[PDB]
Structures are given as C-alpha cells and as structure tokens.
C-alpha cells in the first residue's frame, strides 16, 4: 500500500502522488492508461509538465528535475514520477 | 530481431539509435547499465534531456516536444529512447 522508497519532493508532492496513483490503479486495468492518467492529473494539478513511468520489469538512467523525483510501489508495480 | 514498433524522428537519428542500442545491449547484460550507457552517450551527442529506458514490462506516456521518440523491440527486450 503506502510504500515509498526514494522521494525527492515535499510531503504533499509525495502524498498526492500516492493518492492519485492509488485511484488510477483502482480505476484502470491498463498500464498505459495509468501513465497517461498520472500525466494528465498532475499536469492539471501542479504544473504544466509531469512525466511518469509505470511498470514492473523496467529501470533506467533518467534526467529528472532537481528537487523533483519520486519512486514507489503499489502491490507490485514500480511507479516513478518527476518534473521536466 | 530488430523490430521497431513506434517512432517519430528522422531516419539518420533512428539508425544511430539502433546501432548504439545494439552495441550497448550486446555489451552490458543488465538493462540498468544498458540504459545508463545509452542515455549518457546520447547526452554527449544530442540534447541533454534524452531519456533511454529498457525493460519487458515498461510503459510511460509523458508530455513531450515532438520529433525525438523511438520505441522498438530487439530480440527479447523493449528499448525506448526519447526526448522531452
């Protein structure tokens, strides 16, 4: 459930991420729709740009925004998010 | 098997990415280091926001400036390289 590994934002820009991801996982059945939903909701919530990666067999060097980075799990799904 | 699923680039950029990804995947066993090396090499060559991602259960739809995306399947691995 609430499992966070590496969070680089403040408490609200982590808790809102957890909540939105939770509602996304409970709504959709599609990983691609999860990614698109996170992007859309965070774009209309915080700032014009929001970039997320969702899956279970991935991992990669990535240039996020300084102070902007989060990585967590939901059941088994690695979900990462950041600003550009 | 070099198979390209989706892309939006020029042919020269796509071929450069194909060859660089081929050499990186053949060299490094772990997807993490493969993506690390690829993204660093395209940081050195092109825009310093190139994102290289790798996996077998990977998906991410993020807001982007166009013309710099590719998502292909080589052998039994999915490799993405894009810029936002």
């Amino acid at each position: 459930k609430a499992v966070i590994k590496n969070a680089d934002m403040s408490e609200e820009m982590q808790a809102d991420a957890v909540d939105c991801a939770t509602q996304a996982l409970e709504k959709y059945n599609i990983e691609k729709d999860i990614a698109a939903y996170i992007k859309k909701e965070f774009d209309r919530k915080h700032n014009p740009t929001w970039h997320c990666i969702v899956g279970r067999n991935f991992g990669s060097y990535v240039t996020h925004e300084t102070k902007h980075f989060i990585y967590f799990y939901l059941g088994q799904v690695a979900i990462l998010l950041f600003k550009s | 098997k070099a198979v390209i699923k989706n892309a939006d680039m020029s042919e020269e950029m796509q071929a450069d990415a194909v060859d660089c990804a081929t050499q990186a995947l053949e060299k490094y066993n772990i997807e993490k280091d493969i993506a690390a090396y690829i993204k660093k090499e395209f940081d050195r060559k092109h825009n310093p926001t190139w994102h290289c991602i790798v996996g077998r259960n990977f998906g991410s739809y993020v807001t982007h400036e166009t013309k710099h995306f590719i998502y292909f399947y080589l052998g039994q691995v999915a490799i993405l390289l894009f810029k936002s």
Partner: peptide
C-alpha cells in the same frame, strides 16, 4: 538531476 533506479527483480 541525473539519477539511476530499478528495483525488485521479479
């Protein structure tokens, strides 16, 4: 602004 992560091989 350059980070590395993958986790929980499955």
């Amino acid at each position: 602004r350059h980070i590395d992560i993958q986790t929980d091989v499955y």
